[PDB]
Design a protein around this ligand. Structure first.
Ligand SMILES: CCCCCCCCCCCCCC(=O)SCCNC(=O)CCNC(=O)[C@H](O)C(C)(C)COP(=O)(O)OP(=O)(O)OC[C@H]1O[C@@H](n2cnc3c(N)ncnc32)[C@H](O)[C@@H]1OP(=O)(O)O
Ligand SMILES: N[C@@H](CC(=O)N1C[C@@H](CO)[C@H](c2ccc(Cl)cc2)C1)Cc1ccc(Cl)cc1
Ligand SMILES: [Mg+2]
Length: 411
């Protein structure tokens, strides 16, 4: 059934997953000296290429490949269009490793054919709370605690093969080369998400969408006018009304995050994320990188009253190309990123997210039901979408957990 995935160190079935009771490695402890120094073999007409993702020209080459060949829906209506600024931000966080950005080029015409990228993350990934309780009940707490400390691992994303090269087994080769380069830095696990089902997720969460510009979303066929609105004289007028938002934020003391907010935001985020079984640990430099506003890419606001920051939210932007429409070219989507609420309810904080996103001309706000995102779905008029995102580890056995126990946002 899976000629590549069956050869890799990951749980092979739900049955196998169900037997997993402690966090820990799937495979044999190995060393850097055990790993081939020579790149993985590749066809004599292709070559490995390491782009410099801080150099505008190399970022643009990778941007075009993704623009034309990255994730699209089954009806070929929308294709992700991650921007050049967004790619530099996502792929070059503090202490990133340039050698983890891996491409294939055709030698003859230097045509870019494929890409995959890894970035460092410090991740809590030890046994989850409900399996620690089961371990305690059996007298097995020692074994359950062995990997509690945060681990420096790899997050993999942006795997892409050009449409002309599909179904030629190029993705496994890219994956094997990326794994070699990661293991050559003495890192042996990765985390990754996909919309497709592979062997074997440790968590899965549904998509949610919140309409901001319903007339545009219906015109581009992202949305339809739902059946119950057909009982009205003007179904679209009533749809617009249903999704209408204030034109300015409601929370007093809301303002953009600045560098001087970094220690307070780090404090309240890390206290919040601690409560979840799987979550990142961010340094001041990582908080700066992932949360300070960056035009067109990430938008972050704090609630500051009487000189103290007590709450914050962030969202990021990814436009999608609208593959067939005379009126519009782009779907401008805002995605819920990290947040923390200590002074106001989460729904009141995220209402201001929606207000800001709508004021800035976003068409839809999207998120996955991770974190406490279920706590404001109904009041804020999010609806579930189709399909499931799925969280995976490479070379890590992990008990199945609920998505409300995952705190890692995946870009
Ligand atoms: C310690 C460090 C470890 C580092 C590595 C950790 C692992 C990271 C794993 C990567 C995580 C990436 C996270 C993201 O970026 S998820 C986003 C993935 N990208 C897209 O969906 C963009 C559009 N599609 C494509 O570009 C191609 O269709 C891809 C590149 C997806 C496959 O190309 P193609 O269609 O030409 O097929 P092939 O003949 O070359 O290969 C067929 C094999 O590939 C397996 N396949 C198909 N889709 C995926 C997928 N999304 N993750 C993992 N495996 C996938 C498939 O089951 C089959 O294996 P098996 O079933 O035969 O066994
Ligand atoms: N490594 C994956 C990351 C992921 O699954 N995401 C990225 C996230 C956008 O930042 C997207 C998403 C899509 C829709 C909603 Cl409502 C929320 C998040 C899922 C690659 C990917 C990207 C997009 C999709 Cl739809 C499926 C897989
Ligand atoms: Mg292929």
């Amino acid at each position: 059934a899976h000629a590549f995935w069956s050869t890799q160190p990951v749980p092979q079935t739900e049955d196998e997953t169900e037997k997993i009771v402690f966090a820990g490695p799937m495979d044999e402890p190995k060393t850097v000296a055990d790993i081939p120094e020579e790149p993985y073999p590749i066809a004599s007409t292709f070559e490995w290429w390491t782009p410099n993702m801080e150099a505008a020209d190399d970022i643009h080459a990778i941007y075009e490949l993704l623009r034309d060949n990255y994730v699209e829906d089954d009806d070929s209506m929308f294709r992700f269009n991650y921007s050049e600024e967004f790619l530099q931000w996502a792929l070059c966080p503090p202490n990133y490793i340039p050698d983890w950005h891996v491409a294939v080029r055709r030698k003859a015409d230097k045509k870019l054919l494929a890409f995959i990228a890894g970035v460092p993350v410090t991740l809590r990934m030890g046994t989850p709370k409900y399996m620690k309780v089961k371990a305690q009940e059996k007298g097995e707490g020692e074994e359950a605690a062995k990997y509690d400390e945060p681990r420096h691992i790899c997050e993999i994303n942006f795997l892409c093969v050009h449409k002309q090269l599909r179904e030629k087994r190029l993705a496994p080769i890219l994956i094997k080369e990326a794994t070699r380069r990661v293991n050559r830095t003495n890192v042996w696990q990765a985390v990754y998400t996909a919309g497709v089902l592979l062997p074997t997720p440790y968590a899965s969460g549904q998509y949610f969408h919140r309409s901001l510009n319903p007339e545009k979303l219906v015109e581009i066929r992202f949305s339809g006018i739902p059946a119950q609105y057909q009982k009205f004289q003007n179904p679209m007028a009533m749809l617009k009304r249903n999704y209408q938002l204030p034109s300015a934020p409601k929370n007093s003391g809301l303002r953009e995050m600045k560098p001087s907010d970094v220690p307070q935001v780090r404090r309240i985020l890390m206290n919040y994320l601690d409560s979840f079984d799987v979550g990142p640990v961010f340094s001041d430099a990582e908080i700066s990188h992932y949360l300070l506003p960056r035009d067109g890419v990430v938008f972050t606001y704090v609630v500051e009253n009487d000189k103290k920051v007590t709450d914050f939210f962030s969202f990021y932007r990814i436009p999608s190309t609208v593959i067939g429409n005379s009126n519009y070219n782009l779907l401008n989507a805002a995605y819920v990123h990290y947040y923390a609420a200590t002074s106001i309810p989460l729904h009141q904080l995220i209402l201001d997210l929606l207000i800001v996103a709508h004021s800035r001309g976003f068409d839809v706000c999207n998120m996955v039901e991770i974190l406490d995102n279920r706590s404001f779905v109904e009041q804020l008029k999010f609806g579930a979408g189709d399909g499931h995102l799925r969280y995976y580890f490479y070379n890590w056995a992990y008990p199945k957990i609920k998505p409300s126990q995952v705190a890692l946002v995946m870009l």
